[PDB]
Design a binder for this molecule. Structure first.
Ligand SMILES: [Zn+2]
Ligand SMILES: [Zn+2]
Ligand SMILES: [Zn+2]
Ligand SMILES: [Zn+2]
Length: 301
């Protein structure tokens, strides 16, 4: 082709595994694997799939659909322009179908409403976000999953269609088994722990409406395993000091752990039950006053 969509030196927004957009520069284009090497603002460089890369709208493209690259229009399928990014779309190249020709496209609604800890809950963008989330921008049936239904080949997740790691602040839907980004959800009261599957969750698409979520009751062994796994992933190490790291994390984040029945236990006893859990389950925990996990996987539900 004579006019690639992407090229070296191009400034782009890349969607990361948290569903959020990061400013970057293309350093290498791999047309075979359809990835680019992108350098981000902290100078880190990662491969990013073409589907997750958005360059800026350029002068001269005002009449071009940014999806199918055509200016041609027919009666029931007009061009609509986004007020925020200034890209244009055929009504039918947008998901969901865009209204007849002020309007904001799906990517911009997500860019405005997604937030670490959970998306905006209130206001016009929260409602627009909810409306976008009734539909997926990829086919669920066509995905190829590994045995545990944890990752797919396409790297298509969530309402956004971005990449993702199931153990890194994502929730799985009961009904479709797809995984969804914390940042793209609107139902959480607290940010997710890494690897935390102690929820019942049903997505907007399956419900045809707002998400539904329930935090399951944890046992003390679950608390210990969750905290230790979360720390392992956060800190990228194996062994943690109980007094300098484990217990302080648990104390300082107590209300955010959503511990249900356990949340009322006397403050002077919490250390005892936590440490007892760590000492008693040798199948889960390696002891050193340090503790680590065997083979580093999230707590089983
Ligand atoms: Zn997402
Ligand atoms: Zn189009
Ligand atoms: Zn837009
Ligand atoms: Zn679902």
């Amino acid at each position: 082709g004579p006019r690639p969509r992407l090229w070296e030196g191009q400034d782009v927004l890349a969607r990361w595994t948290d569903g959020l957009l990061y400013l970057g520069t293309i350093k290498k284009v791999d047309s075979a694997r359809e990835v680019c090497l992108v350098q981000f603002e902290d100078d880190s460089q990662f491969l990013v799939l073409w589907k997750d890369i958005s360059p800026a709208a350029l002068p001269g493209e005002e009449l071009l659909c940014c999806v199918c690259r055509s200016e041609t229009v027919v009666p029931g399928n007009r061009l609509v322009s986004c007020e925020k990014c200034r890209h244009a779309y055929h009504q039918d190249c947008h998901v969901p179908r865009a209204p007849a020709p002020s309007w904001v496209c799906r990517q911009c609604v997500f860019a405005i409403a997604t937030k670490r800890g959970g998306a905006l809950k209130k206001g016009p963008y929260a409602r627009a976000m909810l409306g976008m989330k009734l539909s997926l921008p990829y086919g669920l049936k066509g995905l190829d999953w590994d045995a545990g239904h944890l990752s797919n080949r396409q790297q298509s997740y969530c309402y956004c269609g971005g990449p993702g790691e199931w153990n890194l602040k994502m929730l799985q839907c009961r009904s479709c088994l797809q995984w969804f980004h914390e940042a793209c959800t609107q139902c959480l009261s607290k940010p997710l722990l890494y690897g935390d599957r102690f929820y019942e969750f049903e997505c907007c698409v399956c419900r045809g409406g707002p998400e539904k979520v329930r935090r399951l009751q944890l046992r003390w062994v679950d608390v210990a395993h969750l905290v230790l796994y979360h720390l392992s992933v956060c800190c990228k190490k194996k062994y943690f000091d109980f007094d300098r790291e484990i217990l302080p994390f648990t104390s300082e984040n107590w209300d955010s752990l959503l511990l249900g029945e356990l949340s009322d236990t006397p403050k002077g006893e919490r250390s005892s039950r936590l440490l007892s859990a760590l000492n008693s389950h040798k199948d889960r925990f390696i002891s050193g006053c340090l503790f680590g996990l065997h083979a580093r996987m999230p707590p089983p539900v």
